[PDB]
Amino acid sequence: MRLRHLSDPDSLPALDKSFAIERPALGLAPDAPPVRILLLYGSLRARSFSRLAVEEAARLLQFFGAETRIFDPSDLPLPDQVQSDDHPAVKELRALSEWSEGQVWCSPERHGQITSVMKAQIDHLPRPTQGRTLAVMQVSGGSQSFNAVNTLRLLGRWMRMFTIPNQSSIAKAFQEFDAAGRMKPSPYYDRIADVMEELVRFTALVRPHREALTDRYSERKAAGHVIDEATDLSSI
Template structure:
């Protein structure tokens, strides 16, 4: 199910004086509809710092003119379990991935890797549903939170997953160390260099999404797949001709 974003327009740590406005205008392109961004986070704790960081990033994306949806993973079954077949939460997640033009994945680092909660969500999204690819060509931004010193193990794993899912993963990323120090009692991120990096990452995601939104199909078009499609079409034609002759 979708998570409701508290205080969506309240940005106490954001200084609008230093923010770009009208990314599409700066890029010299037609903005069209608002960029559609799906956000996934990787912890079910009541005070989940990956969720709080995701929500902070979501507010920034809304400030930048995006339509944002945050998926709540609390109701997802395990992949490949009998309960997963036709499960409404699984179907919703796949539909949201199809809806999105870009995504944000945010995970805590646990045992030097992403959490099962985040990986569970990605594992429910197949590379292909028939002829439709729910992730291919979408832009992706990756973030992580850590309880200790700064690390990049989780974001590195998320980059690997993004590449495997055939997504356009942007260069910038966010890794927030000692996350328990970076959020106030209300769950809002305090002003810091970490917060500024989150702004950087979300700005870059919007730019890449706008730049690639009309070109993602071409950018992800593959010679090997064109060959395979051509061979299948030729085989079907030959089979049809043989049937007509018989």
């Protein structure tokens, strides 16, 4: 199956547990069953800082009591390749999307743009995406910029997902990951912690109200769904 294996999932050496709240959603909304998050990365390279960033994000999410799933786009058809939504990878990507209650997208910024593999993934998400939350992240080999995360945010908005305000943008990514692929203790890691903390809190909050949040006035008008006793006549 096209899922990435999270090695040492409980090993969080860059996290200061004296400050990390184990259960961020406690008091906001029920945490059972665990909040479901699908994580997507935008690099095919063996040593992808996008994936490794996504993996650190996953470890943090699991620590916060969330259930995670990291999609492996290795064989997902790329944008210019033979498209067919009957493709096994496309089908599994859709399945994971319907599964998730919230999502994390992480893309490298290649010259002010997100990557083909990131686009391909987004293009193959089911407006079935309505009401799911989203956290955006980017990595770059150069100076910190926000073009990729801003692009991701607007794509998420177009799909009617709720993109949280906090986001991650790692500058000179190569300097932040050791040989083992783990992330070094830094403000950047602290930021991913914050983003995942916020995403758990917000997802737990919005997840039980998906129906109601997507029950729109214009949709009721178009369908002729006259509100339960909104008139002075006996319904219906």
